[PDB]
Amino acid sequence: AVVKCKPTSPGRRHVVKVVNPELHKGKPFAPLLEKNSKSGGRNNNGRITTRHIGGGHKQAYRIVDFKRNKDGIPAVVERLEYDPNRSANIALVLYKDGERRYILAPKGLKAGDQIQSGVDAAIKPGNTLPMRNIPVGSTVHNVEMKPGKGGQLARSAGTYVQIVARDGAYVTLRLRSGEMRKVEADCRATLGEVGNAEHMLRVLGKAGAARWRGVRPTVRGTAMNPVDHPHGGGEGRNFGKHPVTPWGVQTKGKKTRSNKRTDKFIVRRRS
Amino acid sequence: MKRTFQPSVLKRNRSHGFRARMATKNGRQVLARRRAKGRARLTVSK
RNA sequence: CGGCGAGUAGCGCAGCUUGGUAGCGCAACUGGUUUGGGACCAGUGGGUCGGAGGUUCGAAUCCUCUCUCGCCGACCA
RNA sequence: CUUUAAUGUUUGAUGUUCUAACGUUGACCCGUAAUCCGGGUUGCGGACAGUGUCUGGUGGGUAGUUUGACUGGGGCGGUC
RNA sequence: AAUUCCUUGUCGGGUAAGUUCCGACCUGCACGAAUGGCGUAAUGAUGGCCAGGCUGUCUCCACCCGAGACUCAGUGAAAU
RNA sequence: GCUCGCCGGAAGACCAAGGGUUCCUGUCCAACGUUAAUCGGGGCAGGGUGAGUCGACCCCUAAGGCGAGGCCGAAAGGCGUAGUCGAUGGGAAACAGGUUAAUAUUCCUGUACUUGGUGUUACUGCGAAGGGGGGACGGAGAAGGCUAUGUUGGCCGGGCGACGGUUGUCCCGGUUUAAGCGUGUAGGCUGGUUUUCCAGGCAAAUCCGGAAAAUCAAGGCUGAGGCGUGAUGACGAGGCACUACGGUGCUGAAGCAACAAAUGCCCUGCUUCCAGGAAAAGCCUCUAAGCAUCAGGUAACAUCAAAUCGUACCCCAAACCGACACAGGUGGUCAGGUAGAGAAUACCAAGGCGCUUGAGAGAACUCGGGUGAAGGAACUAGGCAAAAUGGUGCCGUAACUUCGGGAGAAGGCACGCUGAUAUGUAGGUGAGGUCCCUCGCGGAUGGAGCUGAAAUCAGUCGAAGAUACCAGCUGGCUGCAACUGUUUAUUAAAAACACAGCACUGUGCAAACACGAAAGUGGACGUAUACGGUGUGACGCCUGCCCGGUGCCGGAAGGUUAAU
RNA sequence: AGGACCGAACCGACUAAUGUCGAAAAAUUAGCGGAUGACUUGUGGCUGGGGGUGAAAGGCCAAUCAAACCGGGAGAUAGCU
RNA sequence: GCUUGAGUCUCGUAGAGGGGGGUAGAAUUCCAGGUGUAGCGGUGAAAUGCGUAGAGAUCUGGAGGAAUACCGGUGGCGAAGGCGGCCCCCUGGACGAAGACUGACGCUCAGGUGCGAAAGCGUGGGGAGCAAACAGGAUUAGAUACCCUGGUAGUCCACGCC
């Protein structure tokens, strides 16, 4: 449920746990389980690359099918699950004559439903289909980028991307960030929004809930001394500067998107 | 008040060892800087 | 005891680079308009630059020391 | 000369279409019992992108230094 | 006020006695909106203040156990 | 050798780390030991470490490391797939007694287990670098059943007393036994099974995953503790034979039940919650290429091995690390009795020790302590210290408040011990008989026996009954921080830092941003309900005004302008 | 249920005395905070000197830190005792 | 026991009654391009703001957004507050018509629970027009206003509060 935690003591005073009563309280379905070896901040050259981050409680990453290339075999959704990785919880779906597999729960599904991916399926919560054979003006998610990659677009909990128009052999997509883009019409996507759709107000409530999630404490730049971050130093909380990153680029400002190998495809950027 | 030389002879052999100093380039430099002086203590082998 | 800042009528200011004529806005006051104040529509009176100088072709102006009021620093062991 | 019409003929600007170098952290067999890579198909970008050299800009993210002297201690304000 | 030097600002209160302390005045030399304002239950090896308790902290020290000091034999350095 | 002291979740006993003869015997006392020394962890000499089963090696991985061909790199060298390494984890198996001057689960006595090899015989479809299953898991929290272990009694052996009484309700001592094997229980999960099929596991598949008719409600897996074989054997208080002062050798009774009882075991079991809880080999079944009488694998049995090294001693200390016979610092297991909620504390057991300078006198002064007449913070920078309350059960609990807290607000009430309730009740566990009896380690009933609160009265003693150890000072306001937390390891613990939250802003994926000449990885096997960065910092009441200047974010009219 | 409450082991180290050529190149003896959590510790890896890491003091990287250590440059140079 | 109270049951009839999904036209303010040039907008009159970096104007292609001209009539419903497109779903009340029927079950109701426009608030969506705030331009003796150019909270949806 969307429960409000009855505030006994400090540190239960602000917690709210957006929880499902029907997420299955048992186990991950083991044959889709590879482990993860934690690598907080440090690449294979050691040497902490990303700050701000660290360890926290152990995870066992779930192998999630994203391409959905079965294209013509019906699929019974067995149960939902909580793969702790993304935000968008996962539902184990077995197919007609065999293999059992995890897909993203698209918010409209309760377990037991039939779904089918392909170019020849219905228009329902949980069917994936390539955008040549799509209803225009819909609202979909899990969009691919190339016809065969598998998906990079709107797969975080609750979100969605609205197809707006057909550009002939191209399909333009209204992204939920403000920018919108143009991809060729032969990319594959699933109707509707993803599950865990009210994860947005998951308050943690306490230092404690963060540090076993993986976020690790970061100190303000005017706190530091000036040999450590350009804002550092100051006799009594004095900024006197213009807000830049650790390494120098001014933030709260300059739009550093300059990949240019992608500027062909943005129809209307974000104002 | 734990004191500094907190010993372990496996950590003294994975690091200061022979096979720790014969593999790379600048371990072999060390063994050549020692046997030019020519002393019986060239590594930590025991 | 010491820098920067000046004093132009009751009140507060341009005239001061590179000396040449004492103007200006709002008061006291008097009037037009209205039955009457105030306001608007306009004017009269109000100084020889705190003061003493020397200097000089004539000094508020050019400088120096004072009366007073601003302001800047008056720090280290 | 100001100002217009076409012609010959030479640059430069800008856009569409294209494939052939190049790009490909797209898929797919093979080397190979291998989410490395290389090789060949196929799809998509496409003369842009990336990089080389030259070049203005930006550049405390860094590096090298510089920040007078008499002075009734030094600083101040002078003086040079 | 943790900012207000100037000032013990001046009044109420607590004391027989109040530069700190609680409540306001406004004369903010120089509070005041995220270099965040005001308020805030709980919490704090926290910052002052007050009453009750309680005691050698004090008037004023008095005795008294035990380890050293001191004496003997053994051993026997160090700063300079 | 007697006597007295000290520790007893330790200064006791066993190990890893580490050290490397310090272990035992005979001798030596010149140096070493904060003195001596017939002494020692000091010197000389001899002597001491027995493994198929503990560990290591070994089969296999994790973080991670080298890293063939490679991509890259000015040389070096940086990164990485295949692979091959790396336990603080998974893979085979031993326990009881005795014994050495000194080692043990090693050797001798007894009972046996474990994985391989060969082959007589009986069978006969087996066989991966392949597939599947398992091994494969978290945190917390109770509660049920038991064992370690202890306690009381019975039995059994010896005793009855160096001053009063102690022939019995009396003192003291011992009442030990494993692995394995047979029977499977309290207890947990689970529907088995037969036929016919399947575009699933890169192919294949009599396996497994799925889909369908039949079929009755069972089979099975895991399983502390118990009960007998183990054991007419050993062990066993003690007394006797000998008497080398060490002691040597035979003999040796009882060996019971009940009350308790864990933090250990069933428990890799189960309820529940979000923060979603390691990978491969051993073992197990099923196929491919082959061989298909032969060869391989299964089962019974006989027989033969189990290479190597570590082990001595200390191991909360005089032996490791601290220049040292240093009040210091190091991690894991076992855990006794009486009061006790206990692993607090108090006093003791087994068991180790009396901290390698002793003997006097009893100045001032110093250090650690005890009480202190009357007074009570007068002292002082300040109640710093020191003092004092200090315990379970029952009541009685403010302003304020986020309604939880506050608050163990404050504040008082009874405590010992004997008898009576009752020759020790409630409650706990609970044999036989009896009865049905899926002939059982059953299930009801009955309750002997054995422990044992708590509670009420009388009465009695102290001056004081939580009597000692141990064991909350207390409220009235206010500044700052929301709060638990962290920091200057070694003069700074708070107002500093983080914090959940709020916001701005960047980021559309070969992401931005970073570490690297570069390859590359991190970010993220995540994809704008997410990521970076910045700022302020619970929730509550709120977020005024200036876009100048500095700087970003849009614009491309003009002026100006590098290279060529 | 709890970064819950009093409170041991353990982790830390606010208070006063001793020590301060000491028993110790920061500890002891009493009182003190946390004490199933943002927990402590055990072992084996990873990170590099204008670089590493940092719940951010310019603290920590072997008794040394506003740029560790050893060797080489190097008899650096010193107008100053 | 009664039926004229009140209430049931049976065919239907009219409607902006309520809640929920989607949907259609006109038209404004922007996004993009072509034709095209000194003015657009504005109220009394000006000046801010827009514009020769080519606006306004119109035409072509999209964007959401909110209101649903006309039908609209002191017209129909609701206890009230309030309700105006269409469409499908669910569903509430008023009333006529005659038969069968329970046979006073009625009226009111401090306590009480519930509903209740507008703004106002909390959390997450949203954004055209319009508009508190606010700014500048006039106006004015002053103008913290009426006017003008822009614009923020909000206006709107789900869901709690008020």
Residue numbers in the entry:
A (entry chain b): 1 to 271
B (entry chain D): 1 to 46
From the article:
Using time-resolved cryo-EM, we visualized GTP-catalyzed translocation without inhibitors, capturing elusive structures of ribosome•EF-G intermediates at near-atomic resolution. The structures visualize how nearly rigid EF-G rectifies inherent and spontaneous ribosomal dynamics into tRNA-mRNA translocation, whereas GTP hydrolysis and Pi release drive EF-G dissociation.
Structure VI lacks EF-G, but the tRNA positions and 30S conformation only marginally differ from those in Structure V. With a slightly more swiveled head (18.9°), Structure VI represents a transient translocation intermediate following EF-G dissociation. Novel states in the 25-s dataset with the most translocated tRNAs and most swiveled 30 S head capture a transient equilibrium between the ribosomes with EF-G (Structure V) and without EF-G (Structure VI), suggesting that EF-G•GDP can dissociate from ribosomes prior to the reversal of head swivel. Our structures therefore suggest that in the absence of inhibitors, EF-G dissociates before or during reversal of head swivel.
